[PDB]
Design an enzyme around this catalytic site. Sequence first.
Site, mmCIF file in Angstrom:
data_model
loop_
_atom_site.group_PDB
_atom_site.id
_atom_site.type_symbol
_atom_site.label_atom_id
_atom_site.label_comp_id
_atom_site.label_asym_id
_atom_site.label_seq_id
_atom_site.Cartn_x
_atom_site.Cartn_y
_atom_site.Cartn_z
ATOM 1 N N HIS C 41 -3.069 -6.176 -9.808
ATOM 2 C CA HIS C 41 -3.815 -4.692 -10.231
ATOM 3 C C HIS C 41 -5.026 -4.203 -9.571
ATOM 4 O O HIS C 41 -4.834 -3.050 -9.554
ATOM 5 C CB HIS C 41 -4.415 -4.963 -11.692
ATOM 6 C CG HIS C 41 -5.406 -5.379 -12.319
ATOM 7 N ND1 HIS C 41 -5.563 -7.092 -12.685
ATOM 8 C CD2 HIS C 41 -6.167 -4.509 -12.174
ATOM 9 C CE1 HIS C 41 -6.508 -6.513 -13.142
ATOM 10 N NE2 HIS C 41 -6.950 -5.436 -12.921
ATOM 11 N N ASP C 90 0.185 -11.490 -11.851
ATOM 12 C CA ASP C 90 -0.801 -11.082 -11.282
ATOM 13 C C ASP C 90 -1.790 -11.230 -10.883
ATOM 14 O O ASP C 90 -2.800 -11.580 -10.934
ATOM 15 C CB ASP C 90 -1.974 -9.855 -13.012
ATOM 16 C CG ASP C 90 -2.909 -9.375 -12.835
ATOM 17 O OD1 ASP C 90 -2.587 -8.663 -11.156
ATOM 18 O OD2 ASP C 90 -4.076 -8.522 -13.717
ATOM 19 N N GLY C 190 -13.907 -4.551 -15.159
ATOM 20 C CA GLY C 190 -14.700 -5.014 -13.973
ATOM 21 C C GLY C 190 -14.977 -5.852 -13.217
ATOM 22 O O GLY C 190 -15.171 -6.538 -12.017
ATOM 23 N N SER C 192 -11.900 -8.286 -12.857
ATOM 24 C CA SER C 192 -10.642 -8.530 -12.829
ATOM 25 C C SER C 192 -10.339 -9.090 -11.087
ATOM 26 O O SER C 192 -11.239 -8.673 -10.275
ATOM 27 C CB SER C 192 -10.163 -7.360 -12.415
ATOM 28 O OG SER C 192 -9.570 -6.272 -13.913
ATOM 29 N N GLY C 193 -9.728 -10.343 -11.162
ATOM 30 C CA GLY C 193 -9.351 -11.069 -9.283
ATOM 31 C C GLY C 193 -10.235 -11.977 -9.413
ATOM 32 O O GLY C 193 -10.396 -12.300 -8.820
HETATM 33 N N1 567 Z 1 -10.948 -8.479 -21.961
HETATM 34 C C1 567 Z 1 -10.279 -8.987 -20.498
HETATM 35 N N2 567 Z 1 -10.560 -10.640 -20.232
HETATM 36 C C2 567 Z 1 -9.877 -8.142 -20.078
HETATM 37 C C3 567 Z 1 -8.931 -6.955 -20.517
HETATM 38 C C4 567 Z 1 -8.903 -5.579 -19.196
HETATM 39 C C5 567 Z 1 -8.728 -6.242 -17.699
HETATM 40 C C6 567 Z 1 -8.393 -5.738 -16.438
HETATM 41 N N3 567 Z 1 -6.894 -4.969 -16.678
HETATM 42 C C7 567 Z 1 -6.606 -3.687 -16.713
HETATM 43 O O1 567 Z 1 -6.712 -3.190 -17.774
HETATM 44 C C8 567 Z 1 -4.684 -3.944 -17.115
HETATM 45 C C9 567 Z 1 -4.527 -3.241 -15.912
HETATM 46 C C10 567 Z 1 -2.748 -2.849 -15.495
HETATM 47 C C11 567 Z 1 -2.141 -2.413 -14.480
HETATM 48 N N4 567 Z 1 -1.396 -2.715 -13.317
HETATM 49 O O2 567 Z 1 -3.008 -1.390 -14.159
HETATM 50 N N5 567 Z 1 -4.431 -3.040 -18.595
HETATM 51 C C12 567 Z 1 -4.925 -4.304 -19.866
HETATM 52 O O3 567 Z 1 -5.368 -5.007 -19.464
HETATM 53 C C13 567 Z 1 -3.841 -3.056 -21.038
HETATM 54 C C14 567 Z 1 -2.914 -4.230 -21.890
HETATM 55 C C15 567 Z 1 -2.027 -2.374 -22.490
HETATM 56 C C16 567 Z 1 -1.319 -1.711 -22.113
HETATM 57 N N6 567 Z 1 -1.052 -1.243 -23.417
HETATM 58 C C17 567 Z 1 -1.306 -2.381 -24.262
HETATM 59 C C18 567 Z 1 -1.897 -1.937 -25.610
HETATM 60 C C19 567 Z 1 -1.884 -3.048 -26.750
HETATM 61 C C20 567 Z 1 -2.375 -3.984 -25.647
HETATM 62 C C21 567 Z 1 -2.901 -4.038 -24.496
HETATM 63 C C22 567 Z 1 -2.603 -3.422 -23.733
HETATM 64 N N7 567 Z 1 -5.323 -3.462 -21.880
HETATM 65 S S1 567 Z 1 -6.226 -2.312 -21.849
HETATM 66 O O4 567 Z 1 -5.998 -1.261 -22.037
HETATM 67 O O5 567 Z 1 -7.155 -2.562 -23.319
HETATM 68 C C23 567 Z 1 -7.806 -2.831 -21.209
HETATM 69 C C24 567 Z 1 -8.912 -1.974 -21.038
HETATM 70 O O6 567 Z 1 -8.997 -0.554 -20.840
HETATM 71 O O7 567 Z 1 -10.178 -2.448 -21.021
HETATM 72 C C25 567 Z 1 -9.580 -7.653 -16.998
HETATM 73 C C26 567 Z 1 -10.417 -8.795 -18.009
#
Ligand code: 567
Lengths: 191, 142, 254
Positions: C41, C90, C190, C192-193
């Site tokens: 991602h 991912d 931030g 991620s990865g």
């Molecule tokens: N806590 C962690 N260790 C953690 C959290 C986030 C990340 C980064 N990854 C993302 O933000 C990805 C990106 C997806 C993409 N390919 O673009 N999206 C998410 O995680 C989204 C999934 C998601 C979508 N619809 C939903 C309805 C209900 C619950 C969840 C979701 N959740 S979020 O929007 O809350 C992330 C935020 O904004 O912080 C890494 C570690």
Amino acid sequence: TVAAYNLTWKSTNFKTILEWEPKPVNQVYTVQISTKSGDWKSKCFYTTDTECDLTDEIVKDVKQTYLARVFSYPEPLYENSPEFTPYLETNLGQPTIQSFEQVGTKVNVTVEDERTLVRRNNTFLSLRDVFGKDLIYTLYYWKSGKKTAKTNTNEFLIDVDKGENYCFSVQAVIPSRTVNRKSTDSPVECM
Amino acid sequence: ANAFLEELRPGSLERECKEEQCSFEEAREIFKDAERTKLFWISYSDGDQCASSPCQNGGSCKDQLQSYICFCLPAFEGRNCETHKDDQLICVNENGGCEQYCSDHTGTKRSCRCHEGYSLLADGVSCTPTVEYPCGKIPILE
Amino acid sequence: IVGGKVCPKGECPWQVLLLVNGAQLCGGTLINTIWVVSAAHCFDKIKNWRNLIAVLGEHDLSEHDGDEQSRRVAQVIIPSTYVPGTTNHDIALLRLHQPVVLTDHVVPLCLPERTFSERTLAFVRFSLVSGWGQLLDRGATALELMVLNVPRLMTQDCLQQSRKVGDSPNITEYMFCAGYSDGSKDSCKGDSGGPHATHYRGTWYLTGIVSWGQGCATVGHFGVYTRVSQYIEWLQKLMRSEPRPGVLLRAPFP
Ligand SMILES: N=C(N)c1ccc(CNC(=O)[C@H](CCC(N)=O)NC(=O)[C@@H](Cc2c[nH]c3ccccc23)NS(=O)(=O)CC(=O)O)cc1
Ligand SMILES: *[C@@H]1O[C@H](CO)[C@@H](O)[C@H](O)[C@H]1O
Ligand SMILES: *[C@@H]1O[C@@H](C)[C@@H](O)[C@@H](O)[C@@H]1O
Ligand SMILES: [Ca+2]
Ligand SMILES: [Ca+2]
Ligand SMILES: [Ca+2]
Ligand SMILES: [Ca+2]
Ligand SMILES: [Ca+2]
Ligand SMILES: [Ca+2]
Ligand SMILES: [Ca+2]
Ligand SMILES: [Ca+2]
Ligand SMILES: [Ca+2]
């Protein structure tokens, strides 16, 4: 395959065996046990029985709180067991009156210091070795009229009317406990 | 037990229940009170579950109320000490004692292996680095 | 990283900092002098595929020193099954233009064999997650590399212990949860990865990749990480392959 259920701890004097359902039909099990922040340890590898002895693992630290889980095979299907804190919930075994000596107008009732499965150094620790001051013994004695005595050691020093026979029965107790606070009455012994 | 005319003699725990097998009634004639008789009877008539000698491999049986407890020798465990602790040299059991990779074998004991950059030591389980910077090691702490 | 601490310089030597157009993009894990494992991602909105940089030996983003090594990313390999904007599969395997130099501050984390990781590493309670990600939910990022010890959960437990929500992504067999549900500790966007590293008998192994979650350290939720054990063969096969024209490559999976 179906996950195990009704996981139950069967523990007396630290001899701890996890039991569960159902009777495996083309289904084997493997148990894992751990402490809150410890690694998971596997036990009773691919057993077809519905029980697993976890004594050797819990006696390493009887004061810790353990969690176990049973995996089922034809991530795998599993069921968690309730938490188990040996020291706080292992059943006290039925005690045994070791002896009773009369001097004059007083009797000394001694309760056998029973051994537990807790190993230290190169031997088994006794119930008092493990519980120390948390353990007391209660005496239920009668003439021929109920009477009771309590001791923080393994001996009872009571008064007796000369020329009269008394029967005795003892019970192990851990006052601070909430559940399994007392063992069952020991066999009756009469002088 | 009851022999001819012995019941003419007052009750005696020793002669009746110790030197002989006494029934509930006989015991009740000794203790009299029901509560006291039952307290005596629950243990007297429970029977010794250790009689069947269930504890294996040199273990020691301890009789309990309607059950038993087995004390096992160091290399044994299980309800009846039937589990040989020395017969669990398989990979799913603490990684087979291998420092890194473990392989189970049909017809031959499990073997231990290592990740590239490491080699297996003579003990057959340990791995030693064969390069200056092997993976998974933190140099400033080594 | 929320609720963690600074990773003392040199104690997180396999940590990678990925930049796009000179800007902080994501974390990564070095597993070879030439290969870096990151999250798929992280490349969802990349327009300039030739401006991807991987920095090794990094620690403090505000001070430069001689332990840092920079390399252009020659290739980003993503599973053909990954869908931009989503969470499954991912993972990304990045080939560096030139190999980095292994030093006291730059060392690769071991990519374990699959069965070892599934039967042994998966049952080691705690593992370290690290990165220069957010220090707080929706907060600012960290200048110094942060690290956090988090406990792993089998998926059945994760689902049972998590607050069920509407359009919540499913936790598949290609993922696993780790962390705390009391809102105190977790990795973040931030990060991620970044690596989810497991210590076992003297050696550290790559077991997970910071992937997704509901916010960061949200009460009733755990962080979700890519289950690396499912991709060992995929990764090994690709590392033994010859480069291909064009930075971005979608390789079939399985
Ligand atoms: N806590 C962690 N260790 C953690 C959290 C986030 C990340 C980064 N990854 C993302 O933000 C990805 C990106 C997806 C993409 N390919 O673009 N999206 C998410 O995680 C989204 C999934 C998601 C979508 N619809 C939903 C309805 C209900 C619950 C969840 C979701 N959740 S979020 O929007 O809350 C992330 C935020 O904004 O912080 C890494 C570690
Ligand atoms: C030995 O005897 C006990 C008596 O309870 C029995 O439970 C065992 O199965 C037998 O081997
Ligand atoms: C009873 O306890 C077991 C464990 C063994 O030590 C036996 O020798 C003993 O009689
Ligand atoms: Ca008689
Ligand atoms: Ca008689
Ligand atoms: Ca009689
Ligand atoms: Ca006699
Ligand atoms: Ca007789
Ligand atoms: Ca009668
Ligand atoms: Ca009679
Ligand atoms: Ca008995
Ligand atoms: Ca720097």
